[PDB]
């Protein structure tokens, strides 16, 4: 009974949750178009999701590029190998630390702010009065928030990389006196356009669809009580950033193995 049925009870309830989240997105994207009422609304959500998150990625992009330059130099300088520091900074970022750490910092700021907003909008009766005015809430609220999230992440990755590469080029070339020509020339013929640059672009788009979907669904199907929204915000950061670290292992076994 209890070990047998209650695991059947509590696993079927997950099969409704996957079905409630799929039916939400099909009714949000696949719709009757409007290109001069959603396009002013896309500029607002491209500002809210992206632009306010641009300060946290610039400042935390320089830092993680620096500590791979500091701790990368001190362990390499005994063998007189500091002219291969750029092959460590600009390959940790372009392969793994770029698409992943810029995803966990996106699911934190933008992932919680979308779930705590549509959750509180549902509790302060602004989704019941909007749908009782012949205005679709899945086309007004969810639809310009999905497209502004699948756009803001692959652009925030290349700002995280290009200051991380420059951040390692500040303690390499300038602070610790590695040569200005041997540093960059050893980085250039180790980075290929197909294996290291496009395969970072493919990683960011898959993480953008994943993070934005879980962030809007947990803020739509949330209990509107006090702790209902506080444990839908926790449910966003954990579930959508385990699917980053779960999909990254699958993708890094396919694109680099």
């Amino acid at each position: 009974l209890n070990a047998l049925a209650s695991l059947g009870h509590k696993g079927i309830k997950t099969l409704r949750t996957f079905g409630r989240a799929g039916l939400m997105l099909f009714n949000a994207l696949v719709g009757k178009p409007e290109f001069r009422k959603h396009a002013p609304l896309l500029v607002r959500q491209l500002y809210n999701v992206g632009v306010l998150s641009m300060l946290i990625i610039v400042v935390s992009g320089v830092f993680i590029g620096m500590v791979l330059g500091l701790q990368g130099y001190l362990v390499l300088t005994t063998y007189s190998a500091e002219t291969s520091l750029g092959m460590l900074v600009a390959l940790s970022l372009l392969r793994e630390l770029g698409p992943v750490v810029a995803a966990l910092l996106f699911a934190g700021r933008a992932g919680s702010a979308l779930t705590a907003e549509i959750g509180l909008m549902r509790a302060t009766e602004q989704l019941s009065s909007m749908e009782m005015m012949a205005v679709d809430p899945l086309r007004r609220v969810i639809s310009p928030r999905f497209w502004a999230g699948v756009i803001s992440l692959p652009l925030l990755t290349v700002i995280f990389v290009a200051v991380g590469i420059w951040g390692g080029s500040l303690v390499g070339v300038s602070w610790k006196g590695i040569d200005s020509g041997f540093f960059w020339s050893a980085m250039q013929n180790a980075v290929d356009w197909r294996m290291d640059l496009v395969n970072c672009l493919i990683k960011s788009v898959v993480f953008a669809i994943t993070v934005t979907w879980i962030s809007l669904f947990n803020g739509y199907d949330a209990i509107p009580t006090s702790a209902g929204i506080s444990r839908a915000t926790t449910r966003t950061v954990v579930h959508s950033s385990l699917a980053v670290l779960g999909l990254d292992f699958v993708l890094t076994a396919l694109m680099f193995g």
Binding site: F18, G19, R20, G22, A253, L254
Partner: protein
């Protein structure tokens, strides 16, 4: 509802298929195994490759020791295509580079096969080996 079950099955079946065709397209050996008895295999491991010339013809499988006389024994794995190797060939333990991996080099020993040479098959022996070098015996030979 009934819409929320036929979609949740279809979304889980689509995702699990997409991962289990991605992992299968991201992850078979027509070989035969040989053995050899060395003296010093210093630096070898359980996956260091065996090679003719410089091209890789296989991979060492086991490194199990012989517990009667304490000579280390290896269990090679030569792929099926390079069958006709004589019984009297060679072996060696060389370093790929100057400091690299210790790869177990080969040498197809053909000198002038008039009368007939034995050809190795599943579970034979190599009787001619050449153990690795150690830095102390070289400095012991140079500085004395």
């Amino acid at each position: 509802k009934k819409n929320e079950i036929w979609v949740g099955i279809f979304l889980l079946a689509a995702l699990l298929a997409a991962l289990f065709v991605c992992l299968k397209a991201a992850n078979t050996e027509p070989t035969y195994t040989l053995y050899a008895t060395f003296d010093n295999i210093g630096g070898l491991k359980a996956r260091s490759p065996v090679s003719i010339g410089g091209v890789v013809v296989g991979r060492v499988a086991d490194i199990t020791l012989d517990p009667k006389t304490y000579l280390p024994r290896v269990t090679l794995e030569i792929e099926q295509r390079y069958n006709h190797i004589p019984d009297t060939s060679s072996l060696s333990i060389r370093t790929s580079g100057l400091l690299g991996e210790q790869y177990l080099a080969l040498n197809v020993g053909f000198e002038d096969p008039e009368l007939g040479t034995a050809i190795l098959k599943d579970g034979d022996t190599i009787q001619d080996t050449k153990s690795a070098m150690v830095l102390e015996d070289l400095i012991g030979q140079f500085l004395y």
